[PDB]
Design an enzyme around this catalytic site. Sequence first.
Site, PDB file in Angstrom:
ATOM      1  N   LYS A 151       0.954   4.376  17.389  1.00 59.34           N
ATOM      2  CA  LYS A 151       0.803   4.243  15.565  1.00 59.34           C
ATOM      3  C   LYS A 151       0.688   5.726  15.010  1.00 59.34           C
ATOM      4  O   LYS A 151       1.533   6.101  14.262  1.00 59.34           O
ATOM      5  CB  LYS A 151      -0.267   3.515  15.278  1.00 59.34           C
ATOM      6  CG  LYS A 151      -0.315   1.943  15.774  1.00 59.34           C
ATOM      7  CD  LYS A 151      -2.067   1.775  14.825  1.00 59.34           C
ATOM      8  CE  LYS A 151      -3.071   2.101  15.862  1.00 59.34           C
ATOM      9  NZ  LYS A 151      -4.142   0.842  15.637  1.00 59.34           N
ATOM     10  N   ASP A 169      -5.489   7.535   5.409  1.00 55.23           N
ATOM     11  CA  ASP A 169      -4.160   8.587   5.030  1.00 55.23           C
ATOM     12  C   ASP A 169      -3.124   7.443   4.026  1.00 55.23           C
ATOM     13  O   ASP A 169      -1.890   7.584   3.850  1.00 55.23           O
ATOM     14  CB  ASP A 169      -3.040   8.518   6.717  1.00 55.23           C
ATOM     15  CG  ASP A 169      -2.940   7.059   7.235  1.00 55.23           C
ATOM     16  OD1 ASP A 169      -4.187   6.037   6.797  1.00 55.23           O
ATOM     17  OD2 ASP A 169      -1.928   7.391   7.801  1.00 55.23           O
ATOM     18  N   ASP A 197       1.530  -7.216   6.329  1.00 58.49           N
ATOM     19  CA  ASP A 197       0.585  -6.152   6.806  1.00 58.49           C
ATOM     20  C   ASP A 197      -0.964  -6.927   6.294  1.00 58.49           C
ATOM     21  O   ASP A 197      -0.751  -7.182   4.566  1.00 58.49           O
ATOM     22  CB  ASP A 197       0.497  -5.411   6.963  1.00 58.49           C
ATOM     23  CG  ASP A 197      -0.585  -4.431   6.542  1.00 58.49           C
ATOM     24  OD1 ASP A 197      -0.937  -3.714   6.179  1.00 58.49           O
ATOM     25  OD2 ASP A 197      -1.293  -4.180   8.176  1.00 58.49           O
ATOM     26  N   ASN A 198      -2.349  -7.331   6.841  1.00 59.34           N
ATOM     27  CA  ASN A 198      -3.302  -7.054   5.719  1.00 59.34           C
ATOM     28  C   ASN A 198      -3.421  -8.125   4.418  1.00 59.34           C
ATOM     29  O   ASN A 198      -3.691  -7.827   3.717  1.00 59.34           O
ATOM     30  CB  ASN A 198      -3.668  -5.321   5.657  1.00 59.34           C
ATOM     31  CG  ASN A 198      -4.856  -5.297   6.407  1.00 59.34           C
ATOM     32  OD1 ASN A 198      -5.082  -5.544   8.374  1.00 59.34           O
ATOM     33  ND2 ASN A 198      -5.831  -3.866   6.239  1.00 59.34           N
ATOM     34  N   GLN A 251       0.719  -1.075  -0.325  1.00 61.17           N
ATOM     35  CA  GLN A 251      -0.274   0.069  -0.356  1.00 61.17           C
ATOM     36  C   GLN A 251       0.818   0.959  -0.023  1.00 61.17           C
ATOM     37  O   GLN A 251       1.990   1.201   0.232  1.00 61.17           O
ATOM     38  CB  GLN A 251      -1.101   0.018   0.834  1.00 61.17           C
ATOM     39  CG  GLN A 251      -0.530   0.069   2.812  1.00 61.17           C
ATOM     40  CD  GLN A 251      -1.000  -0.362   3.726  1.00 61.17           C
ATOM     41  OE1 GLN A 251      -1.417   0.403   4.645  1.00 61.17           O
ATOM     42  NE2 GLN A 251      -1.337  -1.621   3.636  1.00 61.17           N
ATOM     43  N   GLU A 264      -0.820 -11.572   8.922  1.00 66.44           N
ATOM     44  CA  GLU A 264      -1.517 -10.823   9.775  1.00 66.44           C
ATOM     45  C   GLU A 264      -3.155 -10.422   8.493  1.00 66.44           C
ATOM     46  O   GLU A 264      -3.689  -9.501   8.464  1.00 66.44           O
ATOM     47  CB  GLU A 264      -1.071  -9.572  10.105  1.00 66.44           C
ATOM     48  CG  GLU A 264      -2.432  -8.739  11.083  1.00 66.44           C
ATOM     49  CD  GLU A 264      -2.381  -7.227  10.647  1.00 66.44           C
ATOM     50  OE1 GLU A 264      -2.841  -6.924   9.822  1.00 66.44           O
ATOM     51  OE2 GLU A 264      -2.812  -6.644  12.030  1.00 66.44           O
TER      52      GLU A 264
END
Lengths: 649, 649
Positions: free
Chosen positions: B520, B345, B380-381, B310, B409
């Site tokens: 974060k 974001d 991630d994701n 991403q 994850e």
Amino acid sequence: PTVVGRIPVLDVRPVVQRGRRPAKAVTGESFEVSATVFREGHDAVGANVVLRDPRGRPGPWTPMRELAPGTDRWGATVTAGETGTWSYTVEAWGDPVTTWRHHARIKIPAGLDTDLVLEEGARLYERAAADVPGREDRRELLAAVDALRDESRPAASRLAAALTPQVDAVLARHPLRDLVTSSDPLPLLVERERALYGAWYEFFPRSEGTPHTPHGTFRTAARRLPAIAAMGFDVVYLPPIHPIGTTHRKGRNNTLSATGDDVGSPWAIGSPEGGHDSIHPALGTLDDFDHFVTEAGKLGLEIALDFALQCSPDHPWVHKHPEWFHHRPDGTIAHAENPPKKYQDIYPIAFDADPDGLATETVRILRHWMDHGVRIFRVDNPHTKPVAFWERVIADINGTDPDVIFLAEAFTRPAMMATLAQIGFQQSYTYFTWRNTKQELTEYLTELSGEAASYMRPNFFANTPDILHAYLQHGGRPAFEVRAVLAATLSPTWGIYSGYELCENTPLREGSEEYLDSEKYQLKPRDWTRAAREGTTIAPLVTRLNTIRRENPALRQLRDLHFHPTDKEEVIAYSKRQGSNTVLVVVNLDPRHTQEATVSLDMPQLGLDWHESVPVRDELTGETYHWGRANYVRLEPGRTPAHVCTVLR
Amino acid sequence: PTVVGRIPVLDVRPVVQRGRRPAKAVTGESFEVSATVFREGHDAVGANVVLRDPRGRPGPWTPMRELAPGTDRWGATVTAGETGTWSYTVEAWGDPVTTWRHHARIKIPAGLDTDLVLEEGARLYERAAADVPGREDRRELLAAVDALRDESRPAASRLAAALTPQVDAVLARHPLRDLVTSSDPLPLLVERERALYGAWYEFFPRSEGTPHTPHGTFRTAARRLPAIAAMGFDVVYLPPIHPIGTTHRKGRNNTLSATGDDVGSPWAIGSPEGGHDSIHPALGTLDDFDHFVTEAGKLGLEIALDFALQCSPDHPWVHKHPEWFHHRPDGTIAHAENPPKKYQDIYPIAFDADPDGLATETVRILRHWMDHGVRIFRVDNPHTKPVAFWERVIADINGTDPDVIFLAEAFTRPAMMATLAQIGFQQSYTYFTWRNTKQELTEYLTELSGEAASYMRPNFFANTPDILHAYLQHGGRPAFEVRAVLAATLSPTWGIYSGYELCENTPLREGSEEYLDSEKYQLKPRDWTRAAREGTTIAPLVTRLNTIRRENPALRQLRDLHFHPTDKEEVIAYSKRQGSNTVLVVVNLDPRHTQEATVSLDMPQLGLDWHESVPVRDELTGETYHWGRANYVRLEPGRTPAHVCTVLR
Ligand SMILES: OCC1=C[C@H](NC2CCCCC2)[C@H](O)[C@@H](O)[C@@H]1O[C@H]1O[C@H](CO)[C@@H](O)[C@H](O)[C@H]1O
Ligand SMILES: OCC1=C[C@H](NC2CCCCC2)[C@H](O)[C@@H](O)[C@@H]1O[C@H]1O[C@H](CO)[C@@H](O)[C@H](O)[C@H]1O
């Protein structure tokens, strides 16, 4: 080169042995193809099933639905037609219109990106319109495109135009499918309708004799067919019809040594008069058999022959093919056992010395009876013969004669019964006779009609010559009524062994499931005319049951079955459906006591809202009742074992 | 050409996707290969597993047993060695020596057929002797053969000569196996031990800085590793280390707009400073990262990097490769959503325009960090990227670099979590944080260590930056202790996010699992030295636990786990075993109240008869106890969260 495709489609079911054997079906049968179907991200997926007939031709557009929320398991019902080897794949895809319609319903009233989402809808419905092939279907979709783009209406009104039912109309017909992913084809084997549906009647021709010649012949037995046809049966299953051995012939009541006129067990196949290809001389000749087959055919009855791959010691095989037997060091051949049972009059076949010889002979023997009109075989005790043998034999026969139905008489462990079905046996005997409570019945039937139905077809014989269950022994006549209602409506194939109708229930001893004075070791003449005159036969009930089966296609199938809860342990209730046909059954499992209960019907499962009345008709009594989600029943044994009801239009 | 063999071998498990993906294992892991195995008739079958290493070399003779009477399901345990792609088959066979011995023990004392039964055995031990190629091993059986035939010897004495354990040896060594049937090979993928076993610690390098430079650097952050390595961890998981975007950077506490110095979420990867291949300049250069990776290795720590496919709107891809994104009609890119959460974001990567380009760049990026010592990737994701994308990327990377571990994850529906594991992901995040009752935990672990263990390896993170479960919120420090014992002993891989040891349990709101003042979105400095002096850290227990794991191989594997019943819903008990090692754990899941219970040990599951003493040592306290079939325990929160016990011989 990845295993998972663009849109994952996995574990397509039904599957048999990871796809190396076919799933089963018959002409006109409905069953549900299923798959796990999902995608990355939050957008909508769709799936559909594609059936291919044996020529490659695909069936109707068959979209699937998620079967329970959050499970990603999808299903659709498909239906087989012409007999042959079919195939099926599941296609999965991105569903952009559902995705967009979901987002436009929140974003447009919130006033978010209203100009962007509406142009998204225009561009996409235009895409949906490029594949729709009707002039009207196109112009309908393209008007919604322009309505989405009309800046002089409020956004709420522009969006509304993309959701009119005329648009869902054109869209249900020709959906816009993105990223179409296919599963690999899975094999389906579609067989003639008798493979799944039919009522069986078993009787011994030799018992249908005359006073002056008591051992019946095919000519005397042919006269028993009209009674059997009149009871509404479709298949007549004969025990072995060949010469019976004399060495170690069993006498009456399974005694080891016969006497001068003891007939011996027909499964003791073989004597110097011939083997499995010959007719037992007291029954007549091969032409007497044709006469029988012909008279049976005229009445609409199909003949099923017993194939017992075994011998009596007088079979010609014993010397013509010693290698088809296992000899102990002293040369004797151990008599067969299915322990604790002892079969002293017969030799088991050994298969590892000349497997080609047994295969060639078995199909020759079977093609012989095939040439004389036998298209169905009850295979005696298959689980004592190798599994790969039956696989090879069924393949040989069906490769040339695909209509030939084999029925496996495999009372044994669950593994072998399953395996034998999956390698070719069109039908299977079951544990039905040992399932007599509401919970046993529910469990077994939930399984047989669950995943097992993709490789097994159950044949619910409520008795055999070897199984007089205690339920019937102690229940008397109302027991025989309940078990027939149960077998005839829980399975599309059921059967009875002659004498069931007369409620023959006297066991050899207590604790035994054998018949006293068993027909296997003696002629069993029966006064059919007296029993009918005196009303001591449930043949009237057996007939109306096969009538209900023939007028109600819900009862001609197996997989669509649902149990409805009742507040009495002895009262079971369930329904089956085929199209508009809905049959609904409530049985009192108490053979001895009147039961009353509340049957709380699961209304959506009959296709109804929770509060509706149901016009039903008790097809046994002809009476009509109006039911709802809860219904009071009272079943008096002897008078009424059950209500068997069709819902009315 | 038949599907089923002479002696059936069917449905061999473990299997993944009908065999089109490999079952998983790690060097030295034990697991059970199983099969349905039976034959026709009543004689005995035997079966064995044949495991093959990647050169084909077969493993030790591994005979199987029926796993329950009458189930015809057989199993045997196998153990993986060297990393590579293995295969395993099950062979089934007729066991003639077992059948004869059975008949010989019954018939010979009754005096039935003694001369025939003894000659049957001699001929057959003769047959076992044609396969032994050693003159002594042969004469061993042949002496039993000669004693079996010695008519000058008592019958009981000839039989004894065929049953000497001295002959049982030469036969278990060289069994007589008839009609040996094989399954088709199934693939096994053996990976390094760290894929199944290891302790993870996640922290933000930028939080470990100086008072003059609050944004830490790799050089300052490297100073935190001694604490981490000393706590007994094996893997250090870093959030993304690349430039963070500025467009729509979130501010403190996940506010939509930042301020002049808000550091932003590290997952907002990308800026004109560089993307996924570059180091965030406030962290230092690629050399500082080398220093960090090298300093970590010296401590026994492995680096796991976060891979987030991403971009922030300032990533160079946004203009270098617009086709890797999804554009609305005005050319803008909708920000990523994972509803109801909004990630304003960052932009999601779109995959259908340039899949080869995304693949090539992805493996390019990963090989860069592989070149700099990173052999583990926390993806991630992953479930927002296509499943087949991860399949092809993981295949590619592991094709050259088979040691690279991927951790997925994917907190989502079970279908997706399963498939990602089955397509390549060495480890998986789990539902662990949402399983806090005794029944939830037992259900989940019964699943994770049951059939799921053939394709998924669980990483039990007790917290993440995104999951502070209400259990920890309300339970305080005794809750944090309980979940660490639970995670560290239920899974061979567990982990904690930095601040767990300080019991940070303050949530965003009531009803949130989000952290207040999330690391974060803000530098989160912590006074590690102060917390230890002040005793407000559970690092001692974390350290104690990781030591217990390292001395007890039962805690370094997943599949052998058994739950033991206790009479209080809040007290759970279980044991794990690896060889002679047995760890047995009793945890009080009540964070607020002392619980006492009787733990009723399932003694056979520990390998003992119901009457034995079990010497244990509580690895947390050093106390020693004598336990038995039933044991009274008392656990006070704060003092004793749990017993973690090793058995002594
Ligand atoms: O074919 C052998 C056999 C078994 C089949 N299946 C049984 C097995 C287990 C459960 C109940 C059904 C058949 O249907 C059954 O007719 C048959 O036995 C009969 O025939 C034998 C041969 O002459 C006699 O030795 C025996 O006494 C008599 O009973
Ligand atoms: O990356 C996507 C995301 C989700 C992951 N999975 C969660 C999902 C919900 C259940 C618990 C786990 C990860 O944990 C977590 O790395 C990540 O979130 C962070 O990344 C965004 C981009 O900068 C910010 O907008 C956001 O504020 C910040 O929190």
